[PDB]
Amino acid sequence: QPEPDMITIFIGTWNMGNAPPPKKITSWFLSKGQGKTRDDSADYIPHDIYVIGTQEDPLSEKEWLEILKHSLQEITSVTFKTVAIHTLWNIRIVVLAKPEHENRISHICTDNVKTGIANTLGNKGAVGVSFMFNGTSLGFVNSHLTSGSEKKLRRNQNYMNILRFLALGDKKLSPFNITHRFTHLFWFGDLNYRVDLPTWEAETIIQKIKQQQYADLLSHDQLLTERREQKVFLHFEEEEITFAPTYRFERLTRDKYAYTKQKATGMKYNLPSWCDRVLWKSYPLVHVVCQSYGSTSDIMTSDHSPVFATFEAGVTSQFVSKNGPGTVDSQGQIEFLRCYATLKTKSQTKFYLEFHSSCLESFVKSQEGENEEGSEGELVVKFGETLPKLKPIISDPEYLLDQHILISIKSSDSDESYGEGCIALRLEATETQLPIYTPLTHHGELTGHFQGEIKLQTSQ
Ligand SMILES: CN1CCN(C(=O)c2ccc(F)c(F)c2)CC1
Ligand SMILES: CN1CCN(C(=O)c2ccc(F)c(F)c2)CC1
Hints:
This protein is mainly β. The protein has 2 domains: 1-325, no CATH class; 326-460, no CATH class. The chain has 8 helices and 21 strands. The protein has helices at 26-29, 61-76, 152-165, 178-181, 202-210, 215-218, 222-228, 397-400; strands spanning 6-15, 34-36, 49-55, 81-88, 91-97, 105-114, 125-133, 136-144, 184-190, 276-282, 288-295, 307-314, 333-343, 351-356, 364-368, 370-373, 379-384, 404-411, 417-424, 434-442, 445-457. The strands form 4 sheets. The protein has a 7-stranded mixed β-sheet, with helices on one face. The longest helix is centred in the N-terminal third of the chain and has 16 residues, at 61-76. It is globular, with a radius of gyration of 23 Å. It binds [3,4-bis(fluoranyl)phenyl]-(4-methylpiperazin-1-yl)methanone (ELQ) (2 copies). One [3,4-bis(fluoranyl)phenyl]-(4-methylpiperazin-1-yl)methanone (ELQ) binds at residues 227-228, 237. It is classed as hydrolase. The assembly is monomeric. INPP5D PanDDA analysis group deposition -- Crystal Structure of the phosphatase and C2 domains of SHIP1 in complex with Z2856434829. The protein is Phosphatidylinositol 3,4,5-trisphosphate 5-phosphatase 1. Organism: Homo sapiens.
């Protein structure tokens, strides 16, 4: 029975509005409704992994698991296994997998982050799950961010707190946050970004939605504009939105957007918005393709519609050679040549690098670099040809070309990371000096760049 090199992943996000779901929610898991929808000819084909995020979820874990599992068994005639379930207040994540994957999944982690302080602490935050699928690390975050049209900056702050403090994946990757710990990271939820148009324009917006003319609305979507300005979700992807705003509906129909201010809303307007979103970030040159992104039309218990997204995702096998794991394979080597980091910092410490990768027996510390001043005010840290030669556990190019090297640049004075990035070993050539590049971030914000050349020796 061969190990897969691709899987498909279902991501759902639904703010349930504190109401029990209707009796049938199968359209959600089938990617049917509005937007980029799934072909009918696929309806019986199970996804490999289903990841369900809810917000304002009124059900117990047991109650929701029974609905989810029996929904999937009805669609697929497969009884899924529960990988993980984690709940913070009314924010929940469920991961379900086909039974054939049970012994391919390991290292399951769960965590949550509570956002805000005093007043603003007690209902918003995030839950997440990570695990290994054979050789591939997968991370999933369901966040419910701060509400309100005039709180985009708070949402951005919530995002940074979640990626800083959510403790998922390999704890040995100590310099790295969740935006670098996984081959594939999916981040979804009620992100609560709004369409920023004047309140007076509510009926105009509704008109546009009824005509399926979303372009003049999406140009004012706060998540797209904040992403464009590099204020949030740096280096993440989102499929094009081709479905109607998913909030705020009158319950029990989808014919009416309920946008006017009420005591129940704190006297706030809720103009129609794409609150409910799926984004992802995968390591460079790993296969990931969005095959659906849309909303259901027939699930109407909430003031939000459910959102679905599905992905093809590249995965790798748990590789064994006669040498590694358990030793190095001297027919393999990774040389980082003529490298330099460009940093936005004003500090004047010396810096060193750490190289982290599951192709190494443990992380590798470099010597300190040589600081120079850049022509436009910057710090340039030069490493020359000084960098340690990295010794992979397995030399086989079928393994090594699928790997990645995480890089942290750390202060000698504090040992704190000033920037993190990732280099793919999916090179155009071996035994050949080739350019490499990564942006560097810290707490998810751009702090610099790392560039130079690589020379990879494999057994072939
Ligand atoms: C509640 N727990 C029970 C223990 N548990 C597993 O045994 C498990 C391991 C791998 C899988 F893929 C899977 F679906 C399940 C995870 C959930
Ligand atoms: C297919 N990908 C390639 C990478 N990518 C961008 O470079 C990007 C361009 C414009 C943006 F507003 C933004 F937020 C990001 C996202 C799309």
